[model samples]
Target: QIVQGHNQVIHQYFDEKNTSGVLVIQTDKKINLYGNALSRANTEYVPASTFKMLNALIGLENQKTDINEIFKWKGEKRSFTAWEKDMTLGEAMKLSAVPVYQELARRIGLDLMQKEVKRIGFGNAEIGQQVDNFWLVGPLKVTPIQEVEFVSQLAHTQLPFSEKVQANVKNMLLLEESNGYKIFGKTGWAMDIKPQVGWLTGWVEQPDGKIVAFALNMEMRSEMPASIRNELLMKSLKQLNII
Candidate 1:
């Protein structure tokens, strides 16, 4: 019934835009899935920058980096001009700066990264050799179901990490708060592969203290606007009266 109820919302937002994807929304009492939930939601894809949330948690837990620690930009040319200057971890997260996170991964080191990812039960939890680029390129993948599960843990501070660390990471993900609800999420774009994958995974805290966790991933083309991810998420939540 849930899938059938949400069918029109999914088609309205996705088909009209000439895109295909999956959306999974979970609450304490129910789970609502739309699109190709059985397959697409279970399919693993490179996490892209979505892993940064966990990266921040691990980095802070190990004291490798802090929210206010400055990451200096060594005049490196970047795809985004905003990333070319020195910034703190919080700023880096806000801009999704690749170089800054690469530096963080280097600081976290391979041994600890491997252990932490495994400990946290991240998808496959395989770090491979290149610590900085593993999640970006290959050897590190997570399904939409996993994404929602992980973020759900983070939402309630149920992860094994210290509450302070989890709280810090949560603050870093805060995107907006209004209309009696707050949205915290991370957007990811896997551009290193063909038929790029886009993700918007996060949770919403409703006015009544109910937390709804959601994950959405879709195939991307060169011409598709990145904002589509956010738009789709908003429409989905609205259709379900989640926010």
Candidate 2:
């Protein structure tokens, strides 16, 4: 069963920010939801760069890309300076480099991408005609709950992809480890739409051997602080005593 209404701290955080969103945290035994999370968690939104997690999985499984292979930077202007240089898949994932993953998607081709996405049962699994931009734009979407489910499988290294591929993707997501807990996560910003959508999703493994999977997405304004994503997440996890 899903648990709700006990995360007052998290609710207050969202309220104080004057933003609307959903946060879902799941463990093996139960799910803890906040901020009307039951309904909003299931509402679909573009996956944006968060799709990189699955994209990396598919690219590795089919040998379309490798962890060590460097994606060359063509000196084109990029949105983020971190994405403007040659980098490996791990670096691309960490930096959320759009052009690099877009190139990888083109190389993966639409046929195989469609097949693999369907096989993994990711969201609506719609690729449309644009293999490179579908997830970033339209016709491809996923719910916060779905994000949690996907990452939970990933955290366990239990996806259908090869163990090595899964492990490599997991390693790429490793953001922090302290006091016996490790946090693995990815951030996404869908800027092609109105009010834009922001996402932070992944799993945390605690000292007691319990894994907590989480997904947070909010309606984002241009002026909002980028760090709010992690701030809300860390606050929620701490309030829940999961860290």
Candidate 3:
């Protein structure tokens, strides 16, 4: 669907290494551009922490967990673990605490997580089936199209889930405010393997009523740095003239 007229795509400073992504941007509550969207990679991704956002939705929905549910940060220092000591759900994501999300998924449980995951949109998804196994660290499958669809479902908050659940999920996401944008994001990194894959998923909304939600996946020779990833994201949004 490429037209030659005024169709100049730009990504001058972004790195491209078999990188694939989808960006759905709506201008003024109407249509500005769909950006780069395709159904090519009909394969599933590990979902990394992108799954956490969805799982957060599911967790809040099930009443198994809540943003304000104060509990001791039951985790000790993991010298090797990426993030530092104790965290709650709000701060956990700000610091990308794998253990907090692991606990969230565990609290959500396999059965409920699975059920709500399917209900949210990933009916055909396959992650290990346990929080420790599947979500926390394991092989999970989600395709490009499915990713777009899942995000679309999230963007519109339309699914088989209740409004309350969606509301709770959105509330949790809004916990952190950074970069002058309302960011409710989750990042995931696989512990081992060369060119480890990392995922960053979230959206930005503007005062003019424009909402842009997206996810980026890549395999890096070095572990993905949260600073660099977040920087790239802010840079991209600025390019889109939204930030």
Candidate 4:
């Protein structure tokens, strides 16, 4: 079922920033929304680092490496503090380490990538010509609604991959825990796109086993505010009384 209404609590959260975006929360029984709702929710944009969530699943499915296996850094200087050293799949996913995942994609190669992407049905599944960075600057895109749907399946372990792949990826996605609920999410910033694109998405689960899958994206400045990328999602969650 679908439920639609304006939530002033959520409206105030974004209204203060004069930002335009979308947020959709889907539980097992029904769906609810706020912000621009369906208009932007249906429009696809670059997956950016959020794509790493799917990549991690693919890596696990292909048995590219065990979750504990270390991916050594080849000593290429980078701007981020997290990207400068060797990392395991667990560490890479938490840090949103691009090069590590890029290397994973490279090893996974075009053949497996094409097959896996098609099999999963991710965001148009157009990888373009670059095997390593397609989800970063290439043609791949996903609507907020689509992201919600994708993660909803992920939340329930409904994807075709093995249970081990599902369990490990879910563990790596952990964001926070409090009051008996756990939040598993990924964050992304697509600086290469016009107006940029920022994403904060994933699902929340409680001890009683209720799940809420969510996706949020906003128009970003060249240097997007951390508040928009991070705080807004938290604010929305609180507004919805989910926290």
Candidate 5:
């Protein structure tokens, strides 16, 4: 069932910014959403860096590498400063380091990767033959609503994974914490796609330990600022009394 005022609350954010997108929020009881509820919530798109959340979890579970182990840089020039240095799994996760996770995909291999993706029922589950770049412009696509559902399972530790795996993933996904509330999730920017695609999906843990999962994505063009992904999402969350 839909929650009351959710539509208006999110409409406020999009209208306030004079932008357009969709937001889906999952509480203990129901899912609330705004924008193009029919298509935005269901239309699958490239997942971008948000896949790190799952990659990290699967890496740890399969012993692909220890979270504490170092992943050395290839000495190649990268676009992001945070990615140029040697990184631990935690560091890679914190920065959404693309190369590191892409390497993890190769290490994990196609057979095992496809198996795990299906096991979790994540999106289209098609890795598209490219072990290194499948999630970007490949066949794997996921909807905002699906992201929320996945994150809700993640927040509650309900996924079919070890508690330690879940705990570490949560730790790495942390974006903000204070006064007994913490936000955990990833932001994604698919620059290679048409109209571009941006995402901010994660959950907020309240002082009382209540968890609220959310996912937001929208069409972004070359001229649009990157911050719109998290900007609109946060504004709606704040308006809804969740942030």
Candidate 6:
């Protein structure tokens, strides 16, 4: 039911950008398995804000952001878009706001962002030596399989982030301050052509003393902010009754 409706959302919402895929994966005992229905299974594209996941992880891991940190809202227009200012990086993420991520990118710097993004395995997937302005959009690319590998690396605590940063990232992954669900995710979108991509990765601990790492990704084109992409993303998991 949900899959068919999700397909309809793609057909209805995607005109500017092609609806490439919606993928889901789960750990199978000691193994991992995945499935996909996307176009760029091997294509390179900008990471959009999806790149923020790693950038933010790097920030917290590197002590660039305090777990309880706050930013003074610039209270001024930022970018060529309508984004709020002085938000906690988490708030920036909640709104899917761009300027903060862009600023974060700036702080991470072309050299550091490029180095970090590539060091995780995307360094030489394409051309340039540095992360371009639209680097997050694409050719900051990855394969569908690589997405899975990335999530795995996060779960295994094997990314290049320092141990404190990793712990902070894990701490920030929770959905709330108490009695909350742990969710690890990020979303990406580009407007030049209006295509959007989403990312949902991380593990949820079960009541049975088990932890399961799962990843779900989606893409579609609509006039809405990433909320739609996020919603559709959840439906994918719900279709399998995982949520």
Q: Using lDDT, give the best candidate's number.
A: 2
Ranking by lDDT: 2, 1, 5, 4, 3, 6
Q: In candidate 2, what are the lDDT values of residues 1-243, reduced to their tens digit? A: 766748677888888878887889888887778863357787899999899999999999999988889889989899887788999999988888889899999999999999999999999988898999998887899998888999999999889999999999999998778798999999998877986988999999888878999999888888888888888888888887778
- Candidate 4's C-alpha runs over 4 A off are 1-3, 36-38
Taking the tens digit of each residue's C-alpha lDDT, what string does model 3 give over 1-243? 212111124233233423433333332232222223223234345666666667667767677777786545556775336465554565665555567777777787777766666655572555555655575345566654455456556656776667776665555555334555675555666546443555556666555455666555544445345555566556566676667
lDDT of 4: 0.83
TM-score of 6: 0.71
Per-candidate TM equals 0.95, 0.96, 0.74, 0.95, 0.93, 0.71
Clashes of 2: 0
Residue-pair clash count for candidate 5? 0
In order, candidate lDDTs are 0.87, 0.88, 0.55, 0.83, 0.84, 0.54
> Model 5 TM-score?
0.93
Model 3 ranges with Cα > 4 A deviation: 1-10, 16-43, 79-86, 174-183, 193-195
Q: Lowest summed lDDT over 10 consecutive residues: which window, candidate 4?
A: 221-230
Candidate 2: clashing pairs of residues: none
* Residue pairs in candidate 1 whose N, alpha carbon or C atoms collide under 3 angstroms: none
lDDT of 4 at 241: 66
Each candidate's root-mean-square deviation in Å?
A: 1.7, 1.2, 4.4, 1.5, 1.8, 5.5
**Model 6, span 30-134: residue lDDT tens:** 432323454443444455555556777866755656657676666776664435556677777656666666666666666666566656775234425444355
- Report lDDT (Cα) of residue 58, candidate 6: 62
Better of 1 and 6 by TM-score: 1
Regions more than 4 Å wrong, model 5:
2-5, 16-18, 36-38
Selected candidate, larger lDDT, 1 vs 3: 1
Candidate 3 structure, TM-score to reference: 0.74
C-alpha lDDT of residue 1 in model 5: 76
- Candidate 1 stretches with Cα past 4 Å from truth are 1-5, 36-38
Q: Kindly report which residue stretches of model 6 are placed more than 4 angstroms away from their true locations once superposed.
A: 1-20, 28-43, 78-83, 123-132, 175-181, 194-198, 201-203
